Amino acid sequence: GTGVLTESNKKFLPFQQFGRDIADTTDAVRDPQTLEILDITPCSFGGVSVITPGTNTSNQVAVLYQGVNCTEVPVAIHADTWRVYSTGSNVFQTRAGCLIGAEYVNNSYECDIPIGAGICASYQTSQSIIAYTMSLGAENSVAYSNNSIAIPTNFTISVTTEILPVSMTKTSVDCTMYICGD
Amino acid sequence: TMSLGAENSVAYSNNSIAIPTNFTISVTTEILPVSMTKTSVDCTMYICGDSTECSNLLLQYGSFCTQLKRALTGIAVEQDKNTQEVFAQVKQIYKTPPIKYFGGFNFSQILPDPSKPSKRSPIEDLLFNKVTLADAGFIKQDLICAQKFKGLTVLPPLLTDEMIAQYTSALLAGTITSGWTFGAGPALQIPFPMQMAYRFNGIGVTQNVLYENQKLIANQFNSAIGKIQDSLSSTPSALGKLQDVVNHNAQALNTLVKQLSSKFGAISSVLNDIFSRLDPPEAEVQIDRLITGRLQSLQTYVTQQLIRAAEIRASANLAATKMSECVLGQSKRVDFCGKGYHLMSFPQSAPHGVVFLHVTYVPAQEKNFTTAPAICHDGKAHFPREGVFVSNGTHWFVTQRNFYEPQIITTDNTFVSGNCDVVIGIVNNTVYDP
Amino acid sequence: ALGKLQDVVNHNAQALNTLVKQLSSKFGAISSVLNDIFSRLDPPEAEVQIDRLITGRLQSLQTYVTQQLIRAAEIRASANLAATKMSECVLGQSKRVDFCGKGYHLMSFPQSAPHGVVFLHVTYVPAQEKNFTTAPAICHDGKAHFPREGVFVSNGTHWFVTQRNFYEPQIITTDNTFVSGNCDVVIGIVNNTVYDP
Ligand SMILES: *[C@@H]1O[C@H](CO)[C@@H](O)[C@H](O)[C@H]1NC(C)=O
Ligand SMILES: *[C@@H]1O[C@H](CO)[C@@H](O)[C@H](O)[C@H]1NC(C)=O
Ligand SMILES: *[C@@H]1O[C@H](CO)[C@@H](O)[C@H](O)[C@H]1NC(C)=O
Ligand SMILES: *[C@@H]1O[C@H](CO)[C@@H](O)[C@H](O)[C@H]1NC(C)=O
Ligand SMILES: *[C@@H]1O[C@H](CO)[C@@H](O)[C@H](O)[C@H]1NC(C)=O
Ligand SMILES: *[C@@H]1O[C@H](CO)[C@@H](O)[C@H](O)[C@H]1NC(C)=O
Ligand SMILES: *[C@@H]1O[C@H](CO)[C@@H](O)[C@H](O)[C@H]1NC(C)=O
Ligand SMILES: *[C@@H]1O[C@H](CO)[C@@H](O)[C@H](O)[C@H]1NC(C)=O
Ligand SMILES: *[C@@H]1O[C@H](CO)[C@@H](O)[C@H](O)[C@H]1NC(C)=O
Ligand SMILES: *[C@@H]1O[C@H](CO)[C@@H](O)[C@H](O)[C@H]1NC(C)=O
Ligand SMILES: *[C@@H]1O[C@H](CO)[C@@H](O)[C@H](O)[C@H]1NC(C)=O
Ligand SMILES: *[C@@H]1O[C@H](CO)[C@@H](O)[C@H](O)[C@H]1NC(C)=O
Ligand SMILES: *[C@@H]1O[C@H](CO)[C@@H](O)[C@H](O)[C@H]1NC(C)=O
């Protein structure tokens, strides 16, 4: 196989050799010399996701790692050449992972680049790419009272558009010549 | 053999009308899925796990693994848009007034609880406890570890449940304090009993009924809400419609992951075995057959994922239109917003779905009467302006159509057109003049 | 603003271009060109390698069609919505809220777009609110007086009856209020004079 040989914590039976997961992949192996449990776990991985503004605007980017405590993405470095994203200058940990190269702001605006779990980044002001928490909308508290009614005294006619697709394009394929050219 | 129902028979005749003399407030329930889990898969290590040469050979097939990822990301962003359009239909974030006395109605069971750490209503908490959902992209540090080790991943929703509950509470406060005016422009406060009087007036029942049966209506509403909580708590199969989504998603993921074990006719299901214990010249062919089988499995998986995404999107559009017509207004489309004449609706969040509480009006206690289409007073037909011409006996009166309340027949609630010889069934009666 | 239709066009172009790119996939065979394969193999070997390409390109075609069927189902759902709107919105006035735009519906006008339609929903939006003091009824001679259509409203001293959507104060006469009962059972009733015309 291939993976990190790792110190195990489970127990086999006095005769068990292999250990299997649901999809019959070798989870643990009986050590050859010593009668010790040894677990085979694929060496850690995950998607690499990159947050960018338009290249028409900038060329610096943030990088989001899905499902990592951010204490292992420096563990799994390219050495073991773009380091500035593995190492911690601006490291913010969220439910989706940690995104490096983006500054966490204690404010809250509308959403531009959805990150997940309520966080979503943007590119603002001395220019950096910020990450903040979404804002639902302007706060409001209507003045309820049991002998008070608000009646409008003026109106505004307003017209809005609504785009709707109706039909797609009608294609047609030639099985014989596509599958089997001439 | 199936029984279709209590076989009944209504006593039709041509001079008889049945008018209810009482009513009943009935809170119904309706549970709708909105979104599903946002999975994402990578070929390179699902198919060719830790096998550089397998990756190099998979490079030949190539363009396939951009269709897969493209479809999956489309589905994920579609789920996010579904949630946006179902819930984010309010401009501001309204707040319930600090003091709660809405004319005797008791919304304690639907408004959020500051006591809980999560500001969810008792009903929302009960729903969340009732439905058991799998890990929603929790940071790894179970069945989830099996899938997560094959490149199969679940992304977390962009809308955390707390801010979904914030949308829900904003909608509740808006519809309680303002009415339907907050969905058609700016919020306009109005006392709740007057709002509910308008809601009666919009189903053909005058408001003098509510202003005189306010206590009964409040008590019935409170008891109905309590019974809703008890019923959807005790019965475990009440909301299996949401559990179906989670079951299907986890089940498809399990089938896909353990499908990695099939050999598809090859000598072994693990590639290093084929590479060490077999000659490369046809090892290429054998592992190519394995790759074709696994690509077929992924393609099938995403085809059912796409069909189920389309069905969930249709359900989400239905939920969004129910949120618009039912919650933000008062619909006349019968059985759209619950069995009976629609009064109000109250949204309540739930995992991967939403649940409404359709308040409706149901007549209770009928009574036979003798009716006429018109009344001939001085050789002129006299039709009812609004209502019916019932009569317990020689006492012909004019009531409204949905609640028995007799009135003397005068020239104010009666309009005249014709002579009393064209109408079949006209009845001689006096029409008092004020 | 109208990228919804451009999305359809782009999806169709991409879906129909991945097929054209797919022919350059050897699919486990020696090469993805039929003539070379037939010109460098004995009849028996060719069949084996060719079957690889034929089966591969067939699969690709099914993958493309199935997705076309799914997309056509989505477009049909969208087209059924458009028809419903054109009928209840362009050919009538709708009472379903947020169906024909936000606000109370007035009119709608269709305009033709490439592979789609766009509507111009003419709505009505109240603008300038004004706090008032209201009551459910008006006890005059011991009898409650409920508004025939509208709400009771006072500007601080006098009481009026106005519409529910536009401040239009009126003197309270007996031609716009209906009597129902006596004034000891409704909570919130207030004294006032109801004019007799
Ligand atoms: C291998 O040699 C070591 C050296 O003492 C011994 O302890 C161990 O038991 C041996 N392995 C086996 C399988 O006997
Ligand atoms: C791992 O993540 C948890 C939260 O899930 C956090 O509390 C902890 O500090 C992180 N690091 C370690 C070494 O556990
Ligand atoms: C409004 O509510 C307050 C407190 O709930 C009460 O004191 C007052 O009398 C009410 N106004 C009415 C019923 O007109
Ligand atoms: C109503 O609003 C319009 C602005 O759209 C303004 O021109 C007009 O004077 C206003 N009328 C009143 C009576 O306030
Ligand atoms: C109407 O029904 C309620 C119970 O829902 C009852 O308390 C009341 O007495 C009834 N009124 C009449 C007139 O039957
Ligand atoms: C409203 O109902 C709740 C039951 O959930 C009850 O605890 C509370 O006392 C009620 N409110 C009043 C004012 O009685
Ligand atoms: C009217 O009388 C008929 C015949 O007795 C009866 O079946 C019906 O129930 C009565 N009306 C009502 C209350 O439905
Ligand atoms: C019918 O109802 C009217 C009004 O309450 C009453 O005057 C009359 O006595 C009733 N029918 C009879 C018994 O004549
Ligand atoms: C009701 O139907 C019967 C049966 O034909 C008929 O004799 C009677 O005249 C009808 N009543 C009226 C008011 O037309
Ligand atoms: C109504 O009265 C007129 C004259 O008063 C009479 O000719 C006619 O037959 C009467 N009809 C009924 C149904 O009593
Ligand atoms: C109505 O009164 C409330 C509280 O007194 C106030 O916040 C609001 O601005 C008032 N509305 C208008 C239109 O002045
Ligand atoms: C209320 O309206 C009446 C109109 O009859 C007017 O005489 C009075 O001055 C107004 N009061 C206020 C406070 O606006
Ligand atoms: C209305 O007037 C009557 C006069 O008999 C009086 O008894 C009652 O208290 C008045 N109501 C209010 C709210 O002032």
mmCIF file with all atom_site columns, C-alpha atoms in Angstrom, chain A residues 29-175:
data_model
loop_
_atom_site.group_PDB
_atom_site.id
_atom_site.type_symbol
_atom_site.label_atom_id
_atom_site.label_alt_id
_atom_site.label_comp_id
_atom_site.label_asym_id
_atom_site.label_entity_id
_atom_site.label_seq_id
_atom_site.pdbx_PDB_ins_code
_atom_site.Cartn_x
_atom_site.Cartn_y
_atom_site.Cartn_z
_atom_site.occupancy
_atom_site.B_iso_or_equiv
_atom_site.pdbx_formal_charge
_atom_site.auth_seq_id
_atom_site.auth_comp_id
_atom_site.auth_asym_id
_atom_site.auth_atom_id
_atom_site.pdbx_PDB_model_num
ATOM 1   C CA . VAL A 1 29  ? -1.948  -4.496 9.949   1.00 0.00 ? 29  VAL A CA 1
ATOM 2   C CA . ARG A 1 30  ? -0.423  -6.848 12.504  1.00 0.00 ? 30  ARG A CA 1
ATOM 3   C CA . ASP A 1 31  ? 3.209   -5.824 12.923  1.00 0.00 ? 31  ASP A CA 1
ATOM 4   C CA . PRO A 1 32  ? 5.509   -8.567 11.559  1.00 0.00 ? 32  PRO A CA 1
ATOM 5   C CA . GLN A 1 33  ? 8.152   -8.828 14.300  1.00 0.00 ? 33  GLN A CA 1
ATOM 6   C CA . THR A 1 34  ? 6.274   -7.519 17.347  1.00 0.00 ? 34  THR A CA 1
ATOM 7   C CA . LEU A 1 35  ? 2.680   -8.522 18.108  1.00 0.00 ? 35  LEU A CA 1
ATOM 8   C CA . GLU A 1 36  ? 1.556   -4.915 17.812  1.00 0.00 ? 36  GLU A CA 1
ATOM 9   C CA . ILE A 1 37  ? -1.418  -3.261 16.141  1.00 0.00 ? 37  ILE A CA 1
ATOM 10  C CA . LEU A 1 38  ? -0.330  -0.912 13.325  1.00 0.00 ? 38  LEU A CA 1
ATOM 11  C CA . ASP A 1 39  ? -2.917  1.311  11.529  1.00 0.00 ? 39  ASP A CA 1
ATOM 12  C CA . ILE A 1 40  ? -2.718  2.384  7.830   1.00 0.00 ? 40  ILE A CA 1
ATOM 13  C CA . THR A 1 41  ? -4.369  5.804  7.361   1.00 0.00 ? 41  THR A CA 1
ATOM 14  C CA . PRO A 1 42  ? -3.953  7.599  4.010   1.00 0.00 ? 42  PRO A CA 1
ATOM 15  C CA . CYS A 1 43  ? -1.621  10.521 4.636   1.00 0.00 ? 43  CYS A CA 1
ATOM 16  C CA . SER A 1 44  ? -3.765  13.571 5.210   1.00 0.00 ? 44  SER A CA 1
ATOM 17  C CA . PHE A 1 45  ? -5.275  15.523 2.330   1.00 0.00 ? 45  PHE A CA 1
ATOM 18  C CA . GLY A 1 46  ? -8.087  17.881 1.400   1.00 0.00 ? 46  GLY A CA 1
ATOM 19  C CA . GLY A 1 47  ? -9.255  20.253 -1.302  1.00 0.00 ? 47  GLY A CA 1
ATOM 20  C CA . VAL A 1 48  ? -7.343  23.478 -1.910  1.00 0.00 ? 48  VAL A CA 1
ATOM 21  C CA . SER A 1 49  ? -9.717  26.346 -2.648  1.00 0.00 ? 49  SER A CA 1
ATOM 22  C CA . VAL A 1 50  ? -8.591  29.806 -3.696  1.00 0.00 ? 50  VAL A CA 1
ATOM 23  C CA . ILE A 1 51  ? -10.448 33.085 -3.185  1.00 0.00 ? 51  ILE A CA 1
ATOM 24  C CA . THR A 1 52  ? -9.580  35.765 -5.719  1.00 0.00 ? 52  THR A CA 1
ATOM 25  C CA . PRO A 1 53  ? -10.895 39.108 -6.888  1.00 0.00 ? 53  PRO A CA 1
ATOM 26  C CA . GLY A 1 54  ? -10.889 39.705 -10.633 1.00 0.00 ? 54  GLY A CA 1
ATOM 27  C CA . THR A 1 55  ? -7.493  39.736 -12.306 1.00 0.00 ? 55  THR A CA 1
ATOM 28  C CA . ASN A 1 56  ? -8.839  42.957 -13.815 1.00 0.00 ? 56  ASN A CA 1
ATOM 29  C CA . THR A 1 57  ? -8.556  44.325 -10.249 1.00 0.00 ? 57  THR A CA 1
ATOM 30  C CA . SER A 1 58  ? -5.792  42.484 -8.374  1.00 0.00 ? 58  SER A CA 1
ATOM 31  C CA . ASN A 1 59  ? -3.549  39.428 -8.405  1.00 0.00 ? 59  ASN A CA 1
ATOM 32  C CA . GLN A 1 60  ? -3.201  38.589 -4.712  1.00 0.00 ? 60  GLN A CA 1
ATOM 33  C CA . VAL A 1 61  ? -5.298  35.683 -3.462  1.00 0.00 ? 61  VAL A CA 1
ATOM 34  C CA . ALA A 1 62  ? -6.370  33.823 -0.332  1.00 0.00 ? 62  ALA A CA 1
ATOM 35  C CA . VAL A 1 63  ? -6.402  30.035 -0.018  1.00 0.00 ? 63  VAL A CA 1
ATOM 36  C CA . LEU A 1 64  ? -9.046  28.018 1.835   1.00 0.00 ? 64  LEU A CA 1
ATOM 37  C CA . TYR A 1 65  ? -8.297  24.482 3.024   1.00 0.00 ? 65  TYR A CA 1
ATOM 38  C CA . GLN A 1 66  ? -11.390 22.348 3.655   1.00 0.00 ? 66  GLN A CA 1
ATOM 39  C CA . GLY A 1 67  ? -11.491 20.397 6.909   1.00 0.00 ? 67  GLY A CA 1
ATOM 40  C CA . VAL A 1 68  ? -8.064  20.994 8.538   1.00 0.00 ? 68  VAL A CA 1
ATOM 41  C CA . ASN A 1 69  ? -7.290  22.320 12.098  1.00 0.00 ? 69  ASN A CA 1
ATOM 42  C CA . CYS A 1 70  ? -4.749  24.657 10.370  1.00 0.00 ? 70  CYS A CA 1
ATOM 43  C CA . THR A 1 71  ? -2.249  23.047 12.801  1.00 0.00 ? 71  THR A CA 1
ATOM 44  C CA . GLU A 1 72  ? -1.608  20.331 10.152  1.00 0.00 ? 72  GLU A CA 1
ATOM 45  C CA . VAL A 1 73  ? -1.390  22.390 6.943   1.00 0.00 ? 73  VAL A CA 1
ATOM 46  C CA . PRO A 1 74  ? 2.019   23.587 8.221   1.00 0.00 ? 74  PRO A CA 1
ATOM 47  C CA . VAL A 1 75  ? 2.607   19.934 9.143   1.00 0.00 ? 75  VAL A CA 1
ATOM 48  C CA . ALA A 1 76  ? 2.001   18.919 5.506   1.00 0.00 ? 76  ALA A CA 1
ATOM 49  C CA . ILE A 1 77  ? 4.274   21.356 3.676   1.00 0.00 ? 77  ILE A CA 1
ATOM 50  C CA . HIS A 1 78  ? 5.647   21.232 0.147   1.00 0.00 ? 78  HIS A CA 1
ATOM 51  C CA . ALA A 1 79  ? 9.079   20.572 1.659   1.00 0.00 ? 79  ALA A CA 1
ATOM 52  C CA . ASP A 1 80  ? 7.764   17.415 3.337   1.00 0.00 ? 80  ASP A CA 1
ATOM 53  C CA . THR A 1 81  ? 7.983   26.521 -2.773  1.00 0.00 ? 81  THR A CA 1
ATOM 54  C CA . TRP A 1 82  ? 4.966   28.745 -2.055  1.00 0.00 ? 82  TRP A CA 1
ATOM 55  C CA . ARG A 1 83  ? 5.265   28.824 1.745   1.00 0.00 ? 83  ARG A CA 1
ATOM 56  C CA . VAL A 1 84  ? 3.550   32.112 2.643   1.00 0.00 ? 84  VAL A CA 1
ATOM 57  C CA . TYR A 1 85  ? 0.182   30.330 2.582   1.00 0.00 ? 85  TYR A CA 1
ATOM 58  C CA . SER A 1 86  ? 1.229   27.314 4.662   1.00 0.00 ? 86  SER A CA 1
ATOM 59  C CA . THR A 1 87  ? 2.909   29.421 7.356   1.00 0.00 ? 87  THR A CA 1
ATOM 60  C CA . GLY A 1 88  ? 0.952   31.708 9.646   1.00 0.00 ? 88  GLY A CA 1
ATOM 61  C CA . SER A 1 89  ? 0.889   35.422 8.915   1.00 0.00 ? 89  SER A CA 1
ATOM 62  C CA . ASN A 1 90  ? -2.888  35.870 8.611   1.00 0.00 ? 90  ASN A CA 1
ATOM 63  C CA . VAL A 1 91  ? -4.479  32.581 9.679   1.00 0.00 ? 91  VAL A CA 1
ATOM 64  C CA . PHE A 1 92  ? -8.200  32.465 10.481  1.00 0.00 ? 92  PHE A CA 1
ATOM 65  C CA . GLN A 1 93  ? -9.858  29.192 11.487  1.00 0.00 ? 93  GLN A CA 1
ATOM 66  C CA . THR A 1 94  ? -13.476 28.584 10.505  1.00 0.00 ? 94  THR A CA 1
ATOM 67  C CA . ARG A 1 95  ? -15.855 25.645 10.254  1.00 0.00 ? 95  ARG A CA 1
ATOM 68  C CA . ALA A 1 96  ? -14.823 25.116 6.626   1.00 0.00 ? 96  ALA A CA 1
ATOM 69  C CA . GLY A 1 97  ? -11.110 25.226 7.468   1.00 0.00 ? 97  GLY A CA 1
ATOM 70  C CA . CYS A 1 98  ? -8.628  28.073 7.601   1.00 0.00 ? 98  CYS A CA 1
ATOM 71  C CA . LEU A 1 99  ? -8.023  30.593 4.843   1.00 0.00 ? 99  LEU A CA 1
ATOM 72  C CA . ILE A 1 100 ? -4.549  32.093 4.664   1.00 0.00 ? 100 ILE A CA 1
ATOM 73  C CA . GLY A 1 101 ? -3.737  35.449 3.130   1.00 0.00 ? 101 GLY A CA 1
ATOM 74  C CA . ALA A 1 102 ? -7.024  37.014 4.195   1.00 0.00 ? 102 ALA A CA 1
ATOM 75  C CA . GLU A 1 103 ? -7.537  39.311 7.180   1.00 0.00 ? 103 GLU A CA 1
ATOM 76  C CA . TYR A 1 104 ? -10.412 38.751 9.591   1.00 0.00 ? 104 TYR A CA 1
ATOM 77  C CA . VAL A 1 105 ? -12.414 41.914 10.281  1.00 0.00 ? 105 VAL A CA 1
ATOM 78  C CA . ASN A 1 106 ? -14.610 42.351 13.343  1.00 0.00 ? 106 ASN A CA 1
ATOM 79  C CA . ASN A 1 107 ? -17.122 44.317 11.238  1.00 0.00 ? 107 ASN A CA 1
ATOM 80  C CA . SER A 1 108 ? -19.876 42.889 9.015   1.00 0.00 ? 108 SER A CA 1
ATOM 81  C CA . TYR A 1 109 ? -20.946 43.845 5.486   1.00 0.00 ? 109 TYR A CA 1
ATOM 82  C CA . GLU A 1 110 ? -23.006 42.167 2.783   1.00 0.00 ? 110 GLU A CA 1
ATOM 83  C CA . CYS A 1 111 ? -21.651 39.042 1.089   1.00 0.00 ? 111 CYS A CA 1
ATOM 84  C CA . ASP A 1 112 ? -19.359 39.005 -1.950  1.00 0.00 ? 112 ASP A CA 1
ATOM 85  C CA . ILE A 1 113 ? -17.436 35.705 -2.070  1.00 0.00 ? 113 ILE A CA 1
ATOM 86  C CA . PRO A 1 114 ? -19.223 32.984 -0.064  1.00 0.00 ? 114 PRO A CA 1
ATOM 87  C CA . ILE A 1 115 ? -16.804 30.915 2.012   1.00 0.00 ? 115 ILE A CA 1
ATOM 88  C CA . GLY A 1 116 ? -19.276 28.896 4.080   1.00 0.00 ? 116 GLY A CA 1
ATOM 89  C CA . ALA A 1 117 ? -20.668 28.658 7.614   1.00 0.00 ? 117 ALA A CA 1
ATOM 90  C CA . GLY A 1 118 ? -21.597 32.336 7.510   1.00 0.00 ? 118 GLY A CA 1
ATOM 91  C CA . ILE A 1 119 ? -18.127 33.677 6.677   1.00 0.00 ? 119 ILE A CA 1
ATOM 92  C CA . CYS A 1 120 ? -17.524 35.267 3.295   1.00 0.00 ? 120 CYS A CA 1
ATOM 93  C CA . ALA A 1 121 ? -14.606 37.345 2.061   1.00 0.00 ? 121 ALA A CA 1
ATOM 94  C CA . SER A 1 122 ? -14.195 40.559 0.048   1.00 0.00 ? 122 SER A CA 1
ATOM 95  C CA . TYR A 1 123 ? -11.492 42.912 -1.249  1.00 0.00 ? 123 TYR A CA 1
ATOM 96  C CA . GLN A 1 124 ? -11.418 46.303 0.488   1.00 0.00 ? 124 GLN A CA 1
ATOM 97  C CA . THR A 1 125 ? -8.948  48.835 1.864   1.00 0.00 ? 125 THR A CA 1
ATOM 98  C CA . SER A 1 126 ? -3.386  49.904 1.667   1.00 0.00 ? 126 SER A CA 1
ATOM 99  C CA . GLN A 1 127 ? -5.337  47.169 -0.118  1.00 0.00 ? 127 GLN A CA 1
ATOM 100 C CA . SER A 1 128 ? -5.974  43.677 1.261   1.00 0.00 ? 128 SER A CA 1
ATOM 101 C CA . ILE A 1 129 ? -8.569  40.902 0.999   1.00 0.00 ? 129 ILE A CA 1
ATOM 102 C CA . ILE A 1 130 ? -10.740 40.798 4.118   1.00 0.00 ? 130 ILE A CA 1
ATOM 103 C CA . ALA A 1 131 ? -12.887 38.047 5.625   1.00 0.00 ? 131 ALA A CA 1
ATOM 104 C CA . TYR A 1 132 ? -15.886 38.854 7.810   1.00 0.00 ? 132 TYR A CA 1
ATOM 105 C CA . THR A 1 133 ? -19.264 37.550 8.977   1.00 0.00 ? 133 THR A CA 1
ATOM 106 C CA . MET A 1 134 ? -22.335 38.042 6.788   1.00 0.00 ? 134 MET A CA 1
ATOM 107 C CA . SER A 1 135 ? -24.913 40.698 7.686   1.00 0.00 ? 135 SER A CA 1
ATOM 108 C CA . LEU A 1 136 ? -28.594 39.854 7.291   1.00 0.00 ? 136 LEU A CA 1
ATOM 109 C CA . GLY A 1 137 ? -29.854 43.398 6.815   1.00 0.00 ? 137 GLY A CA 1
ATOM 110 C CA . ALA A 1 138 ? -30.414 46.759 8.409   1.00 0.00 ? 138 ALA A CA 1
ATOM 111 C CA . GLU A 1 139 ? -31.763 46.405 11.937  1.00 0.00 ? 139 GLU A CA 1
ATOM 112 C CA . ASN A 1 140 ? -35.394 47.484 12.431  1.00 0.00 ? 140 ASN A CA 1
ATOM 113 C CA . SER A 1 141 ? -37.943 47.566 15.292  1.00 0.00 ? 141 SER A CA 1
ATOM 114 C CA . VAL A 1 142 ? -41.457 48.641 14.346  1.00 0.00 ? 142 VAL A CA 1
ATOM 115 C CA . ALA A 1 143 ? -43.293 50.442 17.151  1.00 0.00 ? 143 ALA A CA 1
ATOM 116 C CA . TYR A 1 144 ? -46.055 48.022 18.097  1.00 0.00 ? 144 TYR A CA 1
ATOM 117 C CA . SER A 1 145 ? -48.858 49.448 20.219  1.00 0.00 ? 145 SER A CA 1
ATOM 118 C CA . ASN A 1 146 ? -52.417 48.318 20.837  1.00 0.00 ? 146 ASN A CA 1
ATOM 119 C CA . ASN A 1 147 ? -54.089 51.623 19.884  1.00 0.00 ? 147 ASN A CA 1
ATOM 120 C CA . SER A 1 148 ? -51.716 52.826 17.156  1.00 0.00 ? 148 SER A CA 1
ATOM 121 C CA . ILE A 1 149 ? -52.011 52.387 13.383  1.00 0.00 ? 149 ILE A CA 1
ATOM 122 C CA . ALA A 1 150 ? -49.782 53.749 10.609  1.00 0.00 ? 150 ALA A CA 1
ATOM 123 C CA . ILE A 1 151 ? -51.572 54.737 7.389   1.00 0.00 ? 151 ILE A CA 1
ATOM 124 C CA . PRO A 1 152 ? -49.691 55.880 4.261   1.00 0.00 ? 152 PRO A CA 1
ATOM 125 C CA . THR A 1 153 ? -50.513 59.260 2.775   1.00 0.00 ? 153 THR A CA 1
ATOM 126 C CA . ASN A 1 154 ? -48.668 59.018 -0.562  1.00 0.00 ? 154 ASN A CA 1
ATOM 127 C CA . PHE A 1 155 ? -47.730 56.357 -3.108  1.00 0.00 ? 155 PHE A CA 1
ATOM 128 C CA . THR A 1 156 ? -44.972 55.624 -5.614  1.00 0.00 ? 156 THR A CA 1
ATOM 129 C CA . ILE A 1 157 ? -45.531 53.703 -8.832  1.00 0.00 ? 157 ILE A CA 1
ATOM 130 C CA . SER A 1 158 ? -42.585 51.391 -9.401  1.00 0.00 ? 158 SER A CA 1
ATOM 131 C CA . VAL A 1 159 ? -41.826 49.003 -12.260 1.00 0.00 ? 159 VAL A CA 1
ATOM 132 C CA . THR A 1 160 ? -39.384 46.085 -12.041 1.00 0.00 ? 160 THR A CA 1
ATOM 133 C CA . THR A 1 161 ? -38.025 43.564 -14.521 1.00 0.00 ? 161 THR A CA 1
ATOM 134 C CA . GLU A 1 162 ? -38.083 39.772 -14.263 1.00 0.00 ? 162 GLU A CA 1
ATOM 135 C CA . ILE A 1 163 ? -35.950 37.684 -16.612 1.00 0.00 ? 163 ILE A CA 1
ATOM 136 C CA . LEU A 1 164 ? -37.160 34.194 -17.492 1.00 0.00 ? 164 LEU A CA 1
ATOM 137 C CA . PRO A 1 165 ? -35.701 31.622 -19.907 1.00 0.00 ? 165 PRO A CA 1
ATOM 138 C CA . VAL A 1 166 ? -38.273 29.917 -22.107 1.00 0.00 ? 166 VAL A CA 1
ATOM 139 C CA . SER A 1 167 ? -36.517 27.695 -24.643 1.00 0.00 ? 167 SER A CA 1
ATOM 140 C CA . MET A 1 168 ? -33.053 26.226 -25.088 1.00 0.00 ? 168 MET A CA 1
ATOM 141 C CA . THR A 1 169 ? -31.271 25.376 -28.346 1.00 0.00 ? 169 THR A CA 1
ATOM 142 C CA . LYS A 1 170 ? -32.388 22.438 -30.502 1.00 0.00 ? 170 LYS A CA 1
ATOM 143 C CA . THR A 1 171 ? -29.412 20.222 -31.279 1.00 0.00 ? 171 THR A CA 1
ATOM 144 C CA . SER A 1 172 ? -29.084 17.007 -33.275 1.00 0.00 ? 172 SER A CA 1
ATOM 145 C CA . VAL A 1 173 ? -26.215 14.523 -33.426 1.00 0.00 ? 173 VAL A CA 1
ATOM 146 C CA . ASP A 1 174 ? -25.015 12.083 -36.087 1.00 0.00 ? 174 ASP A CA 1
ATOM 147 C CA . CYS A 1 175 ? -24.190 8.935  -34.125 1.00 0.00 ? 175 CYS A CA 1
#
